[PDB]
Amino acid sequence: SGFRKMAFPSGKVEGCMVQVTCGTTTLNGLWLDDVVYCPRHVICTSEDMLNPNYEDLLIRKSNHNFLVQAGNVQLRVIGHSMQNCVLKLKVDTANPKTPKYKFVRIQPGQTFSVLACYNGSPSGVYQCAMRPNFTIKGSFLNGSCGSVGFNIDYDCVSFCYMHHMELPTGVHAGTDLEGNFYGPFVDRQTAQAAGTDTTITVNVLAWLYAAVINGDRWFLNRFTTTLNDFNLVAMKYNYEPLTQDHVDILGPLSAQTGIAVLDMCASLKELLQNGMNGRTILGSALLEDEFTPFDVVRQCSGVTFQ
Amino acid sequence: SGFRKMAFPSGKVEGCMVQVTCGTTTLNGLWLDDVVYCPRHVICTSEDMLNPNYEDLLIRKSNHNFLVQAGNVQLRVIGHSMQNCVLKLKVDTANPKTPKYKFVRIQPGQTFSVLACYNGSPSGVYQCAMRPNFTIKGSFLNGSCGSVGFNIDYDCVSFCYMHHMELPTGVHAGTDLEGNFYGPFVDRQTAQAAGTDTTITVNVLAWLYAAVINGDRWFLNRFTTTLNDFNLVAMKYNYEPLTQDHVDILGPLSAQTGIAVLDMCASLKELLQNGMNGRTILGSALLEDEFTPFDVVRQCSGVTFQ
């Protein structure tokens, strides 16, 4: 029992992180086989970030302008290509520690672990969600660019995020590992306001099932509701609409607890309308939305990784 | 910017975890050099846990009764000794992945990362605190015994916790790596009620400095206080007494923010007396007490590990 914000073990990713320096800009790269992936804004100075022309800045860059360091060892760069907002630096040495891996583009609401790095060295690991406005609420200082977000299924690392920018509101934006930003964000130091940070309704429901499995039951009310009646209450509180697909995904937690999905919706509706009256749920005085249904099952079942 | 519950990267510890089976009981061991450390209750059946005589149960156990498995490889056990509540199984192969390490016994209020394991395989990593009642609020299912808690200073892993038991209230108890329980807990399946779970006052203060550094300033009030006046308010709310040593430790956060420690105490006193009025601080509607002053500095400075 107990329920924590749990990250994936970071060992398989720690062995992939390097340092990439181009001129006076230093950030993190990901070394998988004979390719290092990093943010293309490695080629920019502080002044270039206001209005950068990446094609033009790239012309003054050769293979030898990219210093890739893994510990006390420099990798030789044998080729470079810009794919969307990432650079692919081809190196002459395949990473001996390369794990089984995949690149995935995740949906809003999906969670992943971040290994925050500085100078190609890991600082720590935490669990994040891709918010419905395509920002993440991370912990990133100067130098953290090129840190990655990932999921693990047994022995295969699914890379889903690379860190590129902090918006003026202190929230984060970045790309998949093909270099395509999540949401409308660009790698320019300009005005880019995030949209409404809506709550991930299906994740709140998962987390309430986790509470029930763990003994926190005070919020279980006497009521049920429909998807349409719940969505009319949800809209007011900036909650994502709940769909049939969401009901389906909560099926296994429904089955384990014997609480119907729509009964758990009516409990949630009462928490939204009435508040929590200073009570807590799994030691939080807010409704937590950064656990997926999959995350609840995994943590409550003790699923392990090769 | 941003502030997360951040664990240490788990790679150095992942490579130390093994599976230990004695008869029909399977749990986790820690393989450091040619010694595997595990909970002595590996030698117990379910019925033995009600009233176990460890010296007597140990007499029916030989070197060959301990099956230690690292992946598809069995380690040979060449000696065993019980030290307090841990077994030290001497194996013929020194762990090639042994990192620089230390065993430390931590104080109440200190934080550490847990690598939760099942069958010697890592499931995930999270940040915990040793509570003032010497319990931890973890996430542990059947089979998690022998999972470890640790801190990292550059390249040296300080092991501080091994998981042994879940109390009937769903909170956790375990030992240092010399096998001495934290607090009055024993490895028996009996009535052992935890004392008052008091709030770690110095950690709340650290976390309020983190909030200030990150832009959350609404709670900064117009007042100051003394240690004695604050402690008279703290006692009522089951907050640990604040000492001069605590004031000293908050010195660096005081210096960085320009907010005197006693001014931050008066802000805290107002939050305790008046509540948070449904406002949040670093996305929490409660006062978080599982960040040390050291943890705030580390996360706000970007300290990395070799």
How is residue B63 annotated by DSSP?
A: G
Chain centroid to CA B141: how far?
Answer: 16
**Pairing of the two strands B156-166 and B100-103:** parallel
Question: What is the C-alpha to C-alpha distance for residues B32 and B15, in angstroms, rounded to an integer?
Answer: 10
Contact (CB, 8 A) for B115 and A9 = yes
Residue B13's φ and ψ, nearest 5 degrees, are -90, -35
**Residue B211, H or E segment:** helix B201-213
**Pairing of the two strands B25-32 and A148-153:** unpaired
- Please give the single-letter amino acid code of residue A178: E
Please list, in sequence order, all residues whose beta carbon lies within 8 angstroms of the beta carbon of residue A101, skipping any fewer than 6 positions away: A32, A156, A157, A158, A159
Question: Hey, which residues does B25 pair with through a beta bridge?
Answer: B22
**Pairing of the two strands B77-83 and A172-175:** unpaired
- Judged by CB atoms closer than 8 Å, whether chains meet at A124 and B278 is answered as no
Residue B257's φ and ψ, nearest 5 degrees, are -95, -15
Which chain B residue has its CA at the smallest distance from A280's CA? Answer: B286
Which chain B residue has its CA at the smallest distance from A151's CA? Answer: B124
> Three-class SS string for chain A?
CCCCCCECCCHHHHCCEEEEEECCEEEEEEEECCEEEEEHHHHCCCCHHHCCCHHHHHHCCCHHHEEEEECCEEECEEEEEEECCEEEEEECCCCCCCCEEEECCCCCCCEEEEEEEECCEEEEEEEEECCCCCCECCCCCCCCCCCEEEEEECCEEEEEEEEEEECCCCCEEEECCCCCECCCCCCCCCCCCCCCCCECHHHHHHHHHHHHHCCCCCCCCCCCCCHHHHHHHHHHCCECCCCHHHHHHHHHHHHHHCCCHHHHHHHHHHHHHHCCCCCCECCECCCCCCCCHHHHHHHHHCCCCC
Query: If phi over 0 gives left and psi between -120 and 50 gives alpha, with beta otherwise, what is residue A57?
Result: alpha
Chain centroid to CA B180: how far?
Answer: 14
Residue A7's φ and ψ, nearest 5 degrees, are -95, 160
Question: Which of B3, B6, B171, B214 best probes binding to A when mutated, by most A CB atoms within 10 angstroms?
Answer: B6
Residue B249's φ and ψ, nearest 5 degrees, are -70, -30
Question: Hey, which residues does A162 pair with through a beta bridge?
Answer: A148, A175
Report yes or no: B137 at the A interface, CB cutoff 8 Å: yes
- Judged by CB atoms closer than 8 Å, whether chains meet at A283 and B284 is answered as no
Which chain B residue has its CA at the smallest distance from A119's CA? Answer: B304
Report yes or no: A1 at the B interface, CB cutoff 8 Å: yes
Q: Which of A125, A285, A302 sits opposite B123 (nearest CB)?
A: A302
Please list, in sequence order, all residues whose beta carbon lies within 8 angstroms of the beta carbon of residue A187, skipping any fewer than 6 positions away: A39, A40, A41, A49, A52, A54, A85, A164, A165, A181
Helix, coil or strand: residue B293: helix
Q: Dihedral (C-alpha) B189, B192, B198, B204: value to the nearest 10 degrees?
A: -20
Question: What is the C-alpha to C-alpha distance for residues A2 and A137, in angstroms, rounded to an integer?
Answer: 24
- Judged by CB atoms closer than 8 Å, whether chains meet at B137 and A2 is answered as yes
Contact (CB, 8 A) for A267 and A219 = yes
Please list, in sequence order, all residues whose beta carbon lies within 8 angstroms of the beta carbon of residue A236, skipping any fewer than 6 positions away: none
Question: What is the C-alpha to C-alpha distance for residues A247 and A234, in angstroms, rounded to an integer?
Answer: 15
Of A110, A161, A124, whose CA–CA distance to A9 is shortest? A124
- Judged by CB atoms closer than 8 Å, whether chains meet at A10 and B10 is answered as yes
Question: What is the C-alpha to C-alpha distance for residues A3 and B3, in angstroms, rounded to an integer?
Answer: 20
Question: Which of A115, A123, A291 best probes binding to B when mutated, by most B CB atoms within 10 angstroms?
Answer: A123
Closest Cα in chain B, distance from residue A124 (Å): 5
Closest Cα in chain A, distance from residue B105 (Å): 22
Q: Which of A15, A126, A278 sits opposite B4 (nearest CB)?
A: A126
Residues of B in contact with A126 (CB under 8 A): 4-7
The question of whether B85 is a catalytic residue gets the answer no
How is residue B134 annotated by DSSP?
A: S
**Pairing of the two strands A156-166 and A100-103:** parallel
Q: Which of A4, A285, A300 sits opposite B286 (nearest CB)?
A: A285
CA of B10: how far to CAs of A60, A251, B13, in Å?
40, 33, 5
Contact (CB, 8 A) for A185 and A192 = yes
- A22, A145, A160, A265: the catalytic one is A145
Of B179, B180, B171, B181, whose CA–CA distance to B129 is shortest? B171
- Judged by CB atoms closer than 8 Å, whether chains meet at A170 and B6 is answered as no
Question: What is the C-alpha to C-alpha distance for residues A9 and A30, in angstroms, rounded to an integer?
Answer: 17
The question of whether A145 is a catalytic residue gets the answer yes
Closest Cα in chain B, distance from residue A87 (Å): 24
Question: Hey, which residues does B80 pair with through a beta bridge?
Answer: B89
- Judged by CB atoms closer than 8 Å, whether chains meet at B9 and A305 is answered as no
Q: Which of B6, B118, B139 sits opposite A125 (nearest CB)?
A: B6
Report yes or no: A50 at the B interface, CB cutoff 8 Å: no
Residue A14 tokens, joined: 């720690």
Report yes or no: B68 at the A interface, CB cutoff 8 Å: no
Report yes or no: A280 at the B interface, CB cutoff 8 Å: yes
Residues of B in contact with A141 (CB under 8 A): 1, 300-302
Sign, Cα dihedral of B300, A132, A200, B140: negative
Q: Which residues of A243-267 are buried (b: 16+ CB within 10 A; e: fewer)?
A: eeebbebbeebbeebebebbbbbbb
Q: Which of B115, B170, B305 sits opposite A9 (nearest CB)?
A: B115
Closest Cα in chain B, distance from residue A60 (Å): 31
Contact (CB, 8 A) for B230 and B242 = yes
Chain centroid to CA B254: how far?
Answer: 26
Residue in this structure with the two tokens 């939080």, named with its chain if needed: A284
Please list, in sequence order, all residues whose beta carbon lies within 8 angstroms of the beta carbon of residue B128, skipping any fewer than 6 positions away: A4, B111, B112, B113, B114, B136, B137, B138, B149, B161, B290
Q: What value, to the nearest 5°, has the Cα angle with vertex A107 and ends A105 and A108?
A: 135
How is residue B40 annotated by DSSP?
A: G
Residue B55 tokens, joined: 């010296």
Of A70, A62, A17, A18, whose CA–CA distance to A43 is shortest? A62
The experimental method is X-ray
Question: What is the C-alpha to C-alpha distance for residues B21 and A282, in angstroms, rounded to an integer?
Answer: 33
Contact (CB, 8 A) for B284 and B214 = no
Chain centroid to CA B82: how far?
Answer: 23
Question: Hey, which residues does B153 pair with through a beta bridge?
Answer: B156
Report yes or no: A126 at the B interface, CB cutoff 8 Å: yes
Query: Based on the number of CB atoms within 10 Å of its own CB, is A178 exposed (0-12), middle (13-18) or buried (19 or more)?
Result: middle
Helix, coil or strand: residue B94: coil
Question: What is the C-alpha to C-alpha distance for residues B9 and B151, in angstroms, rounded to an integer?
Answer: 10
Question: Which of A28, A69, A119, A126 best probes binding to B when mutated, by most B CB atoms within 10 angstroms?
Answer: A126
Question: What is the C-alpha to C-alpha distance for residues B98 and B183, in angstroms, rounded to an integer?
Answer: 29
Question: What is the C-alpha to C-alpha distance for residues A184 and B249, in angstroms, rounded to an integer?
Answer: 44
Question: What is the C-alpha to C-alpha distance for residues B255 and B246, in angstroms, rounded to an integer?
Answer: 15
Of A103, A114, A159, whose CA–CA distance to A137 is shortest? A114
Contact (CB, 8 A) for B1 and B15 = no
Strands in chain B per DSSP E: 17-22, 25-32, 35-39, 66-70, 73-75, 77-83, 86-91, 100-103, 111-118, 121-129, 148-153, 156-166, 172-175
Q: What end-to-end distance do the CA atoms of chain A give, in Å?
A: 23
Contact (CB, 8 A) for A128 and A119 = no
Of B283, B284, B287, whose CA–CA distance to B265 is shortest? B287
Residue in this structure with the two tokens 């690991």, named with its chain if needed: A125
CA of A119: how far to CAs of A67, A73, A145, A165, in Å?
12, 14, 10, 16
Residue in this structure with the two tokens 């390369």, named with its chain if needed: A98
How is residue B153 annotated by DSSP?
A: E
Report yes or no: B10 at the A interface, CB cutoff 8 Å: yes
Contact (CB, 8 A) for A111 and A295 = yes
Residue A40's φ and ψ, nearest 5 degrees, are -60, -20
Question: What is the C-alpha to C-alpha distance for residues B241 and B227, in angstroms, rounded to an integer?
Answer: 9
Question: What is the C-alpha to C-alpha distance for residues A203 and A295, in angstroms, rounded to an integer?
Answer: 9
Question: What is the C-alpha to C-alpha distance for residues A250 and A261, in angstroms, rounded to an integer?
Answer: 7
Chain A and chain B share a number of CB contacts under 8 A equal to: 159
Report yes or no: A197 at the B interface, CB cutoff 8 Å: no
Residues of B in contact with A280 (CB under 8 A): 286
- Judged by CB atoms closer than 8 Å, whether chains meet at B7 and A126 is answered as yes
- B41, B164, B172, B246: the catalytic one is B41
Report yes or no: B256 at the A interface, CB cutoff 8 Å: no
Helix, coil or strand: residue B203: helix
Contact (CB, 8 A) for A65 and A23 = yes
Residues of A in contact with B6 (CB under 8 A): 116, 123-126, 139
Helix, coil or strand: residue B263: helix
Of B259, B16, B203, B124, whose CA–CA distance to A302 is shortest? B124
Question: Hey, which residues does A122 pair with through a beta bridge?
Answer: A117
Contact (CB, 8 A) for A195 and A286 = no
